[PDB]
């Protein structure tokens, strides 16, 4: 299987299993990722997903051999796996080695990035006379300073993970080989919080980028009201009062 | 009094005076803050305000006890004091200790933040099954890198002031206990500049976020014309020519 | 000549030649810059431009003496040289010494900034009772953290290049006196990539700021299709396959 899926408590671990091809995205991998996100969002037993690449490399981008023969790597309505339709639940990318071109675009479509100190990002498409069309040009300038995003886009240069951490692209710098365990620790903190409040918090942040300051509080209030009337909200207050862990139901 | 107000030259010092409750915002504090901003903006003898919390702690958020009994902490049209209606004159937050939840949202509604090296920010609402609705989810992603804002929102973790300074959230790192004096020095630099030009500069920056590149220069020009025809503009030129301090009138 | 223009391979070097006036922009310099950009964009033999100031100083802003006598420094439809109409090809600013007021606004209207370790930026207009109207208030908050942009705007303080590099404003920190050579190295990396893909990458990044997430991929696709059907795209693939340098034609 070109994409491996493992359930661990409330956490879905998604592993691109194409290491001899540096985990490049073909049609198989693209469909596997989309299915994995449909599983994450559709299963009430899951809170967070982690995306990683096996064997020490995250993702070299779209498979060039598969692009050559004309495979349908881009699935209409999802893009490269999920670049044009990110999941509603939180997604963490855990990055070893190279995440280049489509690979950096997979990481950008996640919410959070955990990267080994020796890993690298980049969008080298222009070096081949191409353009990064998986959302890298639309998200990188919103994730790191605009001029740096512009530089990486125009040169195709690598962005080493230490610099990406300094620029705010990488949330956690991990020791080489341990990115996945650092992402699990981050995912376990997110799963310990209120499922409805977590999904509503991300929804407000992502959908507010297409809102207007005119109407930002009004729009946000519609998302807030179901969380504040939720059973979990009452359980949260009782558990904090009794100095114990809350037992979420997702209602 | 739950909010203390002091006039020092052209600077208004606003102190939340509820230290045994960690300066949490009840109805009293919320109304006091709104009044303080109305005083700042309405008094021609004032240029800048500083918001701080007494006793070594900025603000623990909305008072939970007051939220429990149903106090009207949120005043319609202002939010938590002023989160939904920031003042037109510059506001500096000086942060000792913890600024959490609503407290971080008060700081975000200011223009500038001075923070002690040992202070911390955070929005831990999701840990209780709630969501930060005082503007934290709408401003933090515009103040620090998007992924970091997302991480703090999803985990509820603390953001230590040193990191917040590295991320651009904190303007000045102060020695512990001295945040207020560092904020005064920053406020005194702002008050030395042209009052109309200062108020117009902030107005252009804040209102440009809801403008369109199509019409950005046109909109900005309408704000520029009164400042450039102002008496202060002529006084600014004369004083620089004569190598002396300008005497602003605010006209 | 108050603006010097030199062609070196595919790189246009634009030097403000007014060093006794600290390279301040008068009507002459403003028209020279606009002409230089028309040359860059109109000549198919050029890929990238560098803007610098001769003698160790980038640009002190608009010439005050020329503003005093009423020269038309701002040319309608271009602003200060090009602040209101940046070129379509990539522009790099190489900064020695001071880049203040209009000077920082010239640098902001570029795509990339190379700055000597001992150089400084700033917008001190408010210190004279004026406002920075050359785009500094509209671009700085999109280039460095919002609160820092706000601080520099309200105080007029200098932003030293080392800090500007930490904040993401400066792409490359250069040794003092060597900014121009560092900018050439950066320009040479950009010129080695596909001309159409480079111009299309910048166009997507700049025009996406005025797009909506609703329609962002649709808008981007219209720019992508000519690059992907281009002769250069095929040459890029052949050259990478044969492990040799691609010979771009710009078609």
TrEMBL record, chains A, B, C:
Domain of life per record: Bacteria
Keywords carried by this UniProt record: Cholesterol metabolism, Fatty acid metabolism, Lipid metabolism, Lyase, Steroid metabolism, Sterol metabolism
Pathway: Steroid metabolism; cholesterol degradation
Reactions this protein catalyses: (22E)-3-oxochola-4,22-dien-24-oyl-CoA + H2O = (22R)-hydroxy-3-oxo-chol-4-ene-24-oyl-CoA; a (3S)-3-hydroxyacyl-CoA = a (2E)-enoyl-CoA + H2O; a 4-saturated-(3S)-3-hydroxyacyl-CoA = a (3E)-enoyl-CoA + H2O
MF-aspect GO terms: enoyl-CoA hydratase activity
Pfam families (alphabetical): ECH_1
SUPFAM superfamilies noted in UniProt: ClpP/crotonase
Gene Ontology process terms (BP): cholesterol metabolic process; fatty acid beta-oxidation
CDD domains: crotonase-like (cd06558)
Lyase listed as a keyword: yes
UniProt-listed InterPro entries: ClpP/crotonase-like_dom_sf, Enoyl-CoA_hyd/isom_CS, Enoyl-CoA_hydra/iso, Enoyl-CoA_hydra_C
Similarity annotation: Belongs to the enoyl-CoA hydratase/isomerase family.
PANTHER family documented for this protein: ENOYL-COA HYDRATASE, IP11341P-RELATED
Described purpose of this protein according to its UniProt entry: Could possibly oxidize fatty acids using specific components.
Assembly with partners or alone: Homotrimer; substrate probably binds in elongated tunnels between the subunits.
Name of the protein: Enoyl-CoA hydratase EchA19
Annotated organism of origin: Mycobacterium tuberculosis (strain ATCC 25618 / H37Rv)
GN (gene name): echA1
